[PDB]
Symmetry: C3
Subunit: 114 residues, 3 copies
């Protein structure tokens, strides 16, 4: 399970503790061990949303399962909640994409999972 986020806010707000809290939350919402969670947050990007350069973000959560349907709604609410409290990005200027990956299409330690 991989969570990636791009934002135009300052790298000052992207603390190593934020990455930890994201990691923990992703493990919880996907019901997978945190030992497999990878988090990547990218700051101070050149980004617009709705034509303006005000604070915004685009992210994605990629997983083998756990990313289909109304579960994505509940999971979104939590991720949006965490990202705003820490990065102060309004919900109406952020997207998070949910991407289901096949076991044969992701390699860990040199081999696919299936």
């Amino acid at each position: 399970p991989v969570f990636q986020l791009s934002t135009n806010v300052s790298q000052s707000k992207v603390t190593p503790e934020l990455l930890k809290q994201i990691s923990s939350l992703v493990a919880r919402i996907l019901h997978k061990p945190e030992s497999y969670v990878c988090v990547h947050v990218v700051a101070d990007q050149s980004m617009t949303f709705a034509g303006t350069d005000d604070p915004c973000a685009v992210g994605s959560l990629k997983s083998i399962g756990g990313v289909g349907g109304s579960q994505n709604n509940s999971h979104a609410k939590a991720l949006f909640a965490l990202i705003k409290d820490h990065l102060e990005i309004e919900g109406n200027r952020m997207y998070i994409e949910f991407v289901d990956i096949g076991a044969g299409d992701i390699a860990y330690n040199g081999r696919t999972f299936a």
Copy 2:
């Protein structure tokens, strides 16, 4: 609708006006309100194309619909045209990926669209 572009050219060329013109163009070619368009351009990356570090770019346009078939051809011509005039990237060293997203697989303001 999200447009993302990575390039090895200097951040000097990535002006806030470029991002605006991209935003406008993406809204037009997808026939969606610009209020939902997010643009992300990343510059001065470590990239090769055809084995060389000359100017190049890889991008993607992700959307709920509007990204299938020969429409992608017309849309490509316009995006390639804009990116070259501003970033001076030859067409034969750029890729743009078109990615259809399901409504249940992208969250905005804390909830999916379906």
Copy 3:
């Protein structure tokens, strides 16, 4: 064929020769001309794996075909091998995603391939 890699290791290790060796290897493992290969490596990112900020990486290989099934296993072994020798990332802290792209969904030089 596009190979992208994000890592928290220093940009010092991402030499222009590394990008060349990656390019060469991607051409070989996908059996496609290196003239179409694009490589993008991003360094010194804010990333955690398993909750820690030790060296880690996430990448993806996107291609029209050549990315399905047990072939992904053999290809992974080679990519993991190259990335570690040069970037010193342990296999158990790296993911590589394999993504099949439709010919109508990627544009080169202003037009899709189909």
